[PDB]
Design an enzyme around this catalytic site. Structure first.
Site, PDB file in Angstrom:
ATOM      1  N   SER A   1      -0.162  15.494 -12.179  1.00 56.36           N
ATOM      2  CA  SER A   1      -0.360  15.130 -13.575  1.00 56.36           C
ATOM      3  C   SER A   1      -0.548  16.391 -14.411  1.00 56.36           C
ATOM      4  O   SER A   1      -1.083  17.396 -13.938  1.00 56.36           O
ATOM      5  CB  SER A   1      -1.568  14.189 -13.689  1.00 56.36           C
ATOM      6  OG  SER A   1      -1.913  13.964 -15.053  1.00 56.36           O
TER       7      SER A   1
ATOM      8  N   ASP B   1       0.817  -1.196   0.000  1.00 58.02           N
ATOM      9  CA  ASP B   1       0.000   0.000   0.000  1.00 58.02           C
ATOM     10  C   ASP B   1       0.862   1.261   0.000  1.00 58.02           C
ATOM     11  O   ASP B   1       1.332   1.673   1.075  1.00 58.02           O
ATOM     12  CB  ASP B   1      -0.923  -0.008   1.206  1.00 58.02           C
ATOM     13  CG  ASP B   1      -1.853   1.189   1.343  1.00 58.02           C
ATOM     14  OD1 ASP B   1      -1.924   1.946   0.357  1.00 58.02           O
ATOM     15  OD2 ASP B   1      -2.474   1.285   2.437  1.00 58.02           O
TER      16      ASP B   1
HETATM   17  N1  LIG Z   1      -4.092   3.974   0.525  1.00 60.41           N
HETATM   18  C1  LIG Z   1      -4.456   4.261   1.729  1.00 60.41           C
HETATM   19  N2  LIG Z   1      -4.282   3.465   2.799  1.00 60.41           N
HETATM   20  S1  LIG Z   1      -5.472   5.634   2.160  1.00 60.41           S
HETATM   21  C2  LIG Z   1      -5.673   6.418   0.508  1.00 60.41           C
HETATM   22  C3  LIG Z   1      -6.397   7.707   0.795  1.00 60.41           C
HETATM   23  C4  LIG Z   1      -7.773   7.931   0.829  1.00 60.41           C
HETATM   24  C5  LIG Z   1      -8.253   9.187   1.207  1.00 60.41           C
HETATM   25  C6  LIG Z   1      -7.395  10.226   1.556  1.00 60.41           C
HETATM   26 CL1  LIG Z   1      -8.046  11.761   1.984  1.00 60.41          CL
HETATM   27  C7  LIG Z   1      -6.030  10.030   1.583  1.00 60.41           C
HETATM   28  C8  LIG Z   1      -5.543   8.771   1.216  1.00 60.41           C
END
Ligand SMILES: N=C(N)SCc1ccc(Cl)cc1
EC number: 3.4.23.22
Length: 330
Positions: free
Chosen positions: A199, A35
């Site tokens: 991007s 992740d």
């Molecule tokens: N990949 C992860 N564990 S969290 C991804 C995410 C979703 C929302 C926001 Cl605000 C920031 C990151």
């Protein structure tokens, strides 16, 4: 040193990818979700509330002769998902594709939320964002990559996710046979702890490219591509019968449709996501309404270049003193 491990989709939709990870002595192999959007290595374990385990493989630190409890340390994390987990911490030996780290913080779950319980294919997460996001308290811990970096031939890892197929995570080297053309590098901001980049624009299908800055994160732990509402509307307007459904929770489209591709810019270069990558299947079993792979980031607060986008590229996570991101077609 280097490492190289195969990553495999967990289901026919590529909802997530799992990579085998060896933990402890003797090795206990768990299938973790790598992740790049978080910074905790956590696992299902012998400490996880029994009713919250359903098919996962668990880490049992008492069976590892190199496990040491990290005294007083706890962790608790929630995902952009809405899921969460928490527990205590061990240090132990962790190997990924032949690359070994001693003394890695291995966060043992005592509690996991239902979505984790309900997914028997994921034994935990291995975070690859910056260590400033790690949740261990009171002493924050380093990611697997940060612990390995100094030992690596080159302070990089690469993500090469497959479409309905296995792919690869490499540590410490760039496989020049794994992409076509050249790798275009782009600046990264680490201020929020993510692999955050900008991007240079997009195109829909065979349409003209729109030059526009789109700030977002490279997130292997997110399934879909979340982009500004204007961009997403422009995409789905090219699909007859597509609509945003408040009840479903996003854009849906007729499963009989042929989806257009989506191009995103990386500097002057262009990565093309084939239309089939944007099909996430019936919203419910037997439905002729299919879920879209490009969705609005408007409720989220950040744009997310998740697996739908990343799997169309070979992606370099360059962890040099000034980090950068590289993208190549493949
Ligand atoms: N990949 C992860 N564990 S969290 C991804 C995410 C979703 C929302 C926001 Cl605000 C920031 C990151």
């Amino acid at each position: 040193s280097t490492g190289s491990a195969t990553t495999t989709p967990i289901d026919s939709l590529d909802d997530a990818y799992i990579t085998p990870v060896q933990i402890g002595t003797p090795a206990q192999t768990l299938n973790l979700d790598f992740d790049t959007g978080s910074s905790d290595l956590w696992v299902f374990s012998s400490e996880t509330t029994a009713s919250e385990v359903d098919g996962q493989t668990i880490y049992t630190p008492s069976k590892s002769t190199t496990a040491k409890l990290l005294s007083g340390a706890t962790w608790s994390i929630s995902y952009g998902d809405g899921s969460s987990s928490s527990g205590d911490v061990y240090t132990d030996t962790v190997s990924v594709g032949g690359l070994t780290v001693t003394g890695q913080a291995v966060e043992s779950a005592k509690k996991v939320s239902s979505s984790f319980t309900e997914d028997s294919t994921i034994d935990g997460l291995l975070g690859l964002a910056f260590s400033t996001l790690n949740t261990v308290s009171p002493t924050q811990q380093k990611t697997f990559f940060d612990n390995a970096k100094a030992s690596l031939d080159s302070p990089v890892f690469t993500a090469d996710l497959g479409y309905h197929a296995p792919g690869t995570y490499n540590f410490g080297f760039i496989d020049t046979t794994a992409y076509t053309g050249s790798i275009t590098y782009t600046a990264v901001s680490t201020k929020q702890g993510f692999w955050e980049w900008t991007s240079t624009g997009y195109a829909v299908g065979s349409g003209t490219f729109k030059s526009t800055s789109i700030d977002g994160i490279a997130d292997t732990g997110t399934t879909l591509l979340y982009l500004p509402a204007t961009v997403v509307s422009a995409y789905w307007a090219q699909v007859s019968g597509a609509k945003s459904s408040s009840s479903v929770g996003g854009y849906v489209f007729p499963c009989s449709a042929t989806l257009p591709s989506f191009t995103f810019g990386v500097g002057s270069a262009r990565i093309v996501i084939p239309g089939d990558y944007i099909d996430f299947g019936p919203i419910s079993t037997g439905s002729s309404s299919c879920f879209g792979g490009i969705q609005s980031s408007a409720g989220i607060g950040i744009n997310i270049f998740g697996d739908v986008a990343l799997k169309a590229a070979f992606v370099v996570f360059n962890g040099a003193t000034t980090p950068t991101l590289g993208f190549a077609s493949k």
